[PDB]
Design a protein around this nucleic acid. Sequence first.
RNA 1: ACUUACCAACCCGAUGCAAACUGCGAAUACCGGAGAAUGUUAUCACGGGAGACACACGGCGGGUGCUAACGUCCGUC
RNA 2: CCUCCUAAAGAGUAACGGAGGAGCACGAAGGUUGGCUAAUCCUGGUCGGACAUCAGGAGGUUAGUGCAAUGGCAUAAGCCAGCUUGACUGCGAGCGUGACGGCGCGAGCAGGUGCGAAAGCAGGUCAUAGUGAUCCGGUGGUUCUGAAUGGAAGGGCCAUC
RNA 3: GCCUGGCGGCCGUAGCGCGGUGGUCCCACCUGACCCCAUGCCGAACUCAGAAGUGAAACGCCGUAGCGCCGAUGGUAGUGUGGGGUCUCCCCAUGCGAGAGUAGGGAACUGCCAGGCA
Lengths: 116, 136, 79, 50, 177
Amino acid sequence: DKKSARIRRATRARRKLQELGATRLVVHRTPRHIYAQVIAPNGSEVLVAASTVEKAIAEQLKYTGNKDAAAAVGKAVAERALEKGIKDVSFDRSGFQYHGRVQALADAAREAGLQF
Amino acid sequence: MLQPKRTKFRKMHKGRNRGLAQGTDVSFGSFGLKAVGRGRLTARQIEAARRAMTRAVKRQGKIWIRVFPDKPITEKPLAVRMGKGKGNVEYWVALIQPGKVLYEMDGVPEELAREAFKLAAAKLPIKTTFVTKTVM
Amino acid sequence: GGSTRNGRDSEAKRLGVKRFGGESVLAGSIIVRQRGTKFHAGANVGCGRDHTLFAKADGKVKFEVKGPKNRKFISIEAE
Amino acid sequence: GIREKIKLVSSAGTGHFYTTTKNKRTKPEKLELKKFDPVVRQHVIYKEAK
Amino acid sequence: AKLHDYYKDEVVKKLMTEFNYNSVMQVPRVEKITLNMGVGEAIADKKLLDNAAADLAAISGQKPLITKARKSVAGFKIRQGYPIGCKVTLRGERMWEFFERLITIAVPRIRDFRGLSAKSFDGRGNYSMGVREQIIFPEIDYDKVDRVRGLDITITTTAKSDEEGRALLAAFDFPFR
RNA sequence: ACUUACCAACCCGAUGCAAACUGCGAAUACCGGAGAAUGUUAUCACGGGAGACACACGGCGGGUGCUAACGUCCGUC
RNA sequence: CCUCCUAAAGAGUAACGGAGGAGCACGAAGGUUGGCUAAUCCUGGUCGGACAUCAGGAGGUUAGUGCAAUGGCAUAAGCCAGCUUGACUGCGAGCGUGACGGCGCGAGCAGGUGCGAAAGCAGGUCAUAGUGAUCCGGUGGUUCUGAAUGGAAGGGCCAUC
RNA sequence: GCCUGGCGGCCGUAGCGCGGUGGUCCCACCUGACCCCAUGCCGAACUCAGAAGUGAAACGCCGUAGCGCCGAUGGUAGUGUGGGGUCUCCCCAUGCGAGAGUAGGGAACUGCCAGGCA
Ligand SMILES: [Mg+2]
Ligand SMILES: [Mg+2]
Ligand SMILES: [Mg+2]
Ligand SMILES: [Mg+2]
Ligand SMILES: [Mg+2]
Ligand SMILES: [Mg+2]
Ligand SMILES: [Mg+2]
Ligand SMILES: [Mg+2]
Ligand SMILES: [Mg+2]
Ligand SMILES: [Mg+2]
Ligand SMILES: [Mg+2]
């Protein structure tokens, strides 16, 4: 289906991350936007988040959702999370390949101080 | 005459024949010939009966046989010994328990129907009895 | 046509059960031919090469049932 | 069963070797591939395979 | 391009008014063109296939993907996983270019020619026709040929009905009866 | 291409059958935890000494046989 | 020796009871990362048909799994590709299952290695058949031993036939 | 408060079907493609750069009982114990008590974070 596809692509990892019980950094992408969330291991509550859909992170990006944009969100959730002392996490591509705008944001996360 | 055209296995166990019948009331014709006994009609029986039944009404009517063999039944030959492998399927039986409705019949005056059923009955190894359609 | 012959024993089936002081790592449930009959859950998993469910850490045996439509699952709660 | 017992041997000194088998026919080329050598406690090229 | 262009300027125009769709999106569009050979005889002429393939290559922009036998069956003498045909999926520029050299200069070279059929529709606005002997394609060197072969293209479109599908190709010169 | 008081799968509705069917599903049995009464510890371990490894009928659930056998083979009392 | 029923919803359970398989295969048919998803029917399409390949639509695991049966498998255990050799050595809390000989499952620790950005996975293969104790003897390694002493022969130990 | 997106809980009273409805924003299709990166062929998918167009498709929401699903009561089946018979099967006392069907329910419920308009 496409969104259907992505999910089963996404499912194994997710599950192995739940098995392992680990606050996970969850990325999600869209033609126009890129979002990131740091989600407690219980799976049901998010500690930190950031995304190009927030007035700020955006009010100074050429375009939302592109390699550059991503980066901003990365470094965003990165700091925000570090703010709350959330260090150490596991990246969750959620079906998207680890490569695109996704790799930035990811990379930006590290270069911010996030552990993974 | 009458039996599975094919069978996942060649031979059945033997089991037992407890419990009341399941196909229990006239649901195709206007009259039935219900079991009322426990036991097993064999192929040559369901037929012998069927025949009698038929040649009786003559041309007319419709007939339905609700039971059907599908049960192997073997027989160790004569002067052979005990044991050396299970015997050979010799004929087929349908297990029938009290309540089983055996035949149904259709395009015929009550009377004749009974008449016919009385005749087919006398070919059966189990006691039986005549049933009418019933609204519910 | 020359019938007979049979595998043997194999045992198999649940061996621990219910709450139960499942020790450090007991083979509680060994219905191999499964990794399916029962599924690796909570602080018990491994599920060994023959689909055998075992205690990954000592506690009480669980048995639950999740949402890929039923689907069994045995786990180990702390006692 | 037709398939032969090969014997992979440590490239290092060590009289060490793993022991297996190959279908000598379909796979005529002396089988090589790395494995752990315990006397030298290192991963060395093991060779030899019919 | 070209034909693609002809599609937007005129055509969608045509089809919108034919059927007054609410949304332009609702207007049928040629999705892809998947032309396939199907050697059948590579089971004996392993080399015949390579020919066919290189043929589809010539005719169509680029590299033909060879198809195995989905499953083995004794009727036609074929083992499962047997190279027994090759195909090509066309999209964007290359799909249009061939949609044109197709009706523009090749469908014409067909025998005597007297029109394609407009009943060759799967029931959901998708075409399908045969060519029985390529050659009609200039890209093939007649003096270098090795057999008549012939392929078969089928046009897959977003039409919901043959009614519509027809109208679509109907609006490119596209021959027909 | 049509046809034919030929047979006709699948599909739909209606009706049954299954040890080697099951989108249901008991009674019991078995496993675990606590608890009380009650039992010449009936439990477990280790050690001394054994005998026994031809069983029979009866009830219940079955296989085999003919739901034959004071038959035959298992379960359980 | 393996799968099913007989077997009475824990295990186990007999018969010259009912049915079938094994005595192998694979250096990829193992590992991992990334990816993908059958069968069957209707319809349209050169040669091409009832049935080879192409398209669409229903379908949704009835397909597939080297191989019997059963139980599993979509997070796939099915299908493909890149890089590989964890088909690693030493061990092993703690379980199973056996009268016994023994067989089996196992996280975790040490060294060292592959895949992956990472979390991480890997001590063969969806699992359960694919096997032969002891003796004697051979081959490699190892001063452990070595009949006055030094050696040697032979013996031990580890691997293996 | 309405709307949307993301991550879960529960895992069909949560689904399918028919009807209706939404695009400022979010989603989606969409545009472009030398390039990152991709096609055992194909920018379909994966992907990057975008935003002229549309909410057709898909997606969400609202309605709707055709089907799915859930589902009593009462009876029936079986069955532990104790008795009994006309013992291939059955009955009585007592305890447990289905499956199917019937009436009926049903067009989910719910938590964290964010974004849009009020
Ligand atoms: Mg004592
Ligand atoms: Mg004896
Ligand atoms: Mg004896
Ligand atoms: Mg006895
Ligand atoms: Mg006796
Ligand atoms: Mg049992
Ligand atoms: Mg039992
Ligand atoms: Mg056809
Ligand atoms: Mg709708
Ligand atoms: Mg719409
Ligand atoms: Mg009920």
